[PDB]
Structure 1
Amino acid sequence: SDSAINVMKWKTVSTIFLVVVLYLIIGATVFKALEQPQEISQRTTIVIQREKFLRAHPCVSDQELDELIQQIVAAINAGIIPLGASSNQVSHWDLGSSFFFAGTVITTIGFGNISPRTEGGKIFCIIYALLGIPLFGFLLAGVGDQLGTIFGKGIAKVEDTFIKWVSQTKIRIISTIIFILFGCVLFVALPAVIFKHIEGWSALDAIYFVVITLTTIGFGDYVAGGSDIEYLDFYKPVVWFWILVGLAYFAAVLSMIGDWLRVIAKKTKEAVGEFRAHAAE
């Protein structure tokens, strides 16, 4: 009976699919409820700014203003500061930023503030990713090991002193609490504070950055080291180390959250069974 389990597998996958379909629909409406208003409030107030310089300079062709703005937004994607009060310009592909870029490729964070424009840069980025992503995986896995065996020494000491008048499978709950607590301190809270001061971000923007980065979603709306401001350069190599170990942390956390879903799915799969079997007495 090889096809027997396969019929049972397709049933499980199809239900998860429809859950994901419905989870996206929920998220979709939640986001547009949150972001549609600010969008329209800013599109109406950008047309207010539009006609303030549409008719304050009629001697501009007025179809070429909207083509001008295309030419600025097209060139802003490579990163430009097209100003006369600042015509000397730092490079986005210097010795360090191309090193940053390679990191965003193999980690699959891919902020996208810096992206290749040359046809050769694209072809190499394709080759660099298909080899670098697996290569980086072994590093991140070994970092997960070393970081995990450090925590194993930490709970060996703590699961010794909390042995008062003790069960085996319930202290596992205490160990997962100290993991998430210490974890969010070293890899979420403490770094976000540093980004708040050094980058100038808000308290929310920093934690937003930490999560979007270490989950490798990497929108790129916020990037550490993205400005010119000062950058001690004590700063940036520490952020590399943060990513290396912070990615290893969310790797476990996200896997823990996955197992929680497994349990919640089991509890709710049987709750529907109990709901049926009772059906109002």
Structure 2
Amino acid sequence: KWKTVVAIFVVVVVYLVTGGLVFRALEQPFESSQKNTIALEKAEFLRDHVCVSPQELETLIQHALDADNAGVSPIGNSSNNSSHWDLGSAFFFAGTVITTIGYGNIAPSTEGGKIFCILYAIFGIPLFGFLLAGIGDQLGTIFGKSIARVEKVFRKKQVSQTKIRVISTILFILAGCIVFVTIPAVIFKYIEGWTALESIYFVVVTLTTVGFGDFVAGGNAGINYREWYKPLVWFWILVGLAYFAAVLSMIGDWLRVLSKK
């Protein structure tokens, strides 16, 4: 019904205003802190290095940013050996577009690169949708057979179909939270050398297809990653996304029969 659609809309607008106030309270003090630190460090550099003019400083900072925007770190000369568009990294970038994660640590700079990216997303995102619905249907049948087995057991125990379906879904959600969320975060903690939080934050930001790109697997210039690392990460992204898609498909299929009745 539309009456409940407007109800969902009010809850969402309230949730965004709430979220907004919480994010402000948590991040604005640090944002205002870094605002002051940069202003101090720049004014400090100019007073410590008299031979540098304020405009000469601005020109360099601009050059540093211009390079960083293109995906080239303006730190060190030895870093000019590792590419972001090599077959391997270009494969993982292509997959980043197709999964709608769109990390953002690297993006097309060329006009043609942007043109191709528009067309690559337009046809590629539905192509992945088919693969995800493919694995989603296969896993959904396995979920359906598993729930049917539990349904026959708890039917004798005098338990409602909705109560069985709800508890089963929580269990499937928890199963994926260990296998595809907890276990890989622990692996990223040791491999990438991130904190316990940064690792879980990365996995959540990844598997939700939010993809901030403030944390990317196989992104460190310092860490000497193995050849199988980046393909294993995208493979985990594929199995992980398909698992939570198969659970979401299962919930959606039940709600469609609920709307019909």
Q: TM-score range by the shorter chain?
A: 0.7 to 0.9
Match of 1:75 in 2: 67
1:137-216 mapped onto 2 (5 Å cutoff): 137-155=129-147, 165-169=157-161, 170-216=163-209
Identical columns (%): 70
Match of 2:239 in 1: 245
Instruction: Return 5+ residue gaps in structure 2 as ranges.
Output: 254-261
In structure 2, how many angstroms separate the alpha carbons of the residues matched to 1:139 and 1:198? 29
Q: 1:34 aligns with which of 22, 26, 29?
A: 26
**Quick check: 1:133 aligned with 2:125?**
yes
User: What TM-score, normalized by structure 1, do the two folds share?
Assistant: 0.79
The alignment's C-alpha RMSD in Å is: 2.7
Aligned length: 252
In structure 1, how many angstroms separate the alpha carbons of the residues matched to 2:241 and 2:234? 11
Deviates more, 1:161-170 or 1:172-181: 161-170
Q: Which has the higher contact order (CA 8 A, sep 6+)?
A: 2
Distance change (3 Å), C-alpha of 1:239 and 1:154: farther
On the 8 A contact 2:172/2:247 being kept in 1, the answer is: no
- How far 1:29 moved relative to its partner? 0.9
On the 8 A contact 1:111/1:219 being kept in 2, the answer is: yes
Distance change (3 Å), C-alpha of 1:91 and 1:109: same
On the 8 A contact 2:182/2:200 being kept in 1, the answer is: yes
In structure 1, how many angstroms separate the alpha carbons of the residues matched to 2:46 and 2:167? 65
In structure 2, how many angstroms separate the alpha carbons of the residues matched to 1:33 and 1:90? 39
Instruction: Return 5+ residue gaps in structure 1 as ranges.
Output: 1-7, 260-281
User: What TM-score, normalized by structure 2, do the two folds share?
Assistant: 0.85
Distance change (3 Å), C-alpha of 1:214 and 1:171: same
- How far 1:198 moved relative to its partner? 0.7
Match of 2:13 in 1: 21
On the 8 A contact 2:185/2:203 being kept in 1, the answer is: yes
**Quick check: 1:120 aligned with 2:112?**
yes
- CA deviations over 1:52-105 (Å, ceiling 9, x no partner): 211111221212212321221122012223355526421110011111111011
Distance change (3 Å), C-alpha of 1:165 and 1:92: closer
Name the SS of the counterpart of 1:117 in structure 2: coil
- How far 1:12 moved relative to its partner? 4.3
In structure 1, how many angstroms separate the alpha carbons of the residues matched to 2:224 and 2:134? 34
In structure 2, how many angstroms separate the alpha carbons of the residues matched to 1:89 and 1:96? 15
- How far 1:239 moved relative to its partner? 1.5
Give, as a single letter, the amino acid of the residue that structure 1 aligns with 2:57: L
On the 8 A contact 2:67/2:73 being kept in 1, the answer is: no
In structure 1, how many angstroms separate the alpha carbons of the residues matched to 2:26 and 2:171? 34
On the 8 A contact 2:101/2:209 being kept in 1, the answer is: yes
Structure with greater Cα Rg: 1
On the 8 A contact 1:81/1:89 being kept in 2, the answer is: no
Match of 2:256 in 1: none
Distance change (3 Å), C-alpha of 1:255 and 1:148: closer
- How far 1:114 moved relative to its partner? 1.6
Distance change (3 Å), C-alpha of 1:85 and 1:129: closer
In structure 1, how many angstroms separate the alpha carbons of the residues matched to 2:153 and 2:24? 51
Give, as a single letter, the amino acid of the residue that structure 2 aligns with 1:61: S
- How far 1:148 moved relative to its partner? 2.3
Give, as a single letter, the amino acid of the residue that structure 2 aligns with 1:53: F
Match of 2:229 in 1: 235
In structure 1, how many angstroms separate the alpha carbons of the residues matched to 2:31 and 2:248? 32
On the 8 A contact 1:107/1:133 being kept in 2, the answer is: yes
**Quick check: 1:65 aligned with 2:57?**
yes
Distance change (3 Å), C-alpha of 1:106 and 1:73: same
In structure 1, how many angstroms separate the alpha carbons of the residues matched to 2:157 and 2:75? 73
